[PDB]
Amino acid sequence: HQFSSLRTPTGDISGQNKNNLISGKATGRVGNYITVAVEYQQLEEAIKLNQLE
């Protein structure tokens, strides 16, 4: 919050034009999926690749 002031030379001015209270927001959300997919013959892959690592 931020405020602004007034410049007057009198003190018994208890009734005047005051400030205002405005509340803001900053909204965060989720994005799209990060997906990588492979299709392949698992037997041919496992011919020479242990544990698919």
Partner: protein, 80 residues
């Protein structure tokens, strides 16, 4: 091959009997045709046959037992 088979099926129309040389040629052609198309299926493992510890079985390598004829279950259509 097809020509000799058709000739053997058609001689009876004119009532002419074949000859040993024609029969041998037809046999050789049919044998070559059959040779060019051979399947000789290789039998697969039973399904309850265990897989030894040498084939390291894990979630991402192989299951404890050899895969078989059983179709994978969809989850809907539970009964066949």
């Amino acid at each position: 091959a097809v020509g000799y088979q058709l000739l053997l099926r058609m001689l009876s129309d004119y009532s002419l009997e074949p000859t040993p040389q024609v029969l041998s040629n037809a046999q050789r052609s049919y044998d070559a045709l059959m040779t060019d198309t051979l399947v000789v299926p290789s039998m697969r493992r039973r399904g309850d046959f265990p897989v030894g510890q040498g084939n390291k079985y894990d979630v991402f390598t192989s299951d404890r037992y050899y895969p078989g004829d059983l179709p994978l279950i969809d989850g809907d259509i539970p009964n066949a």
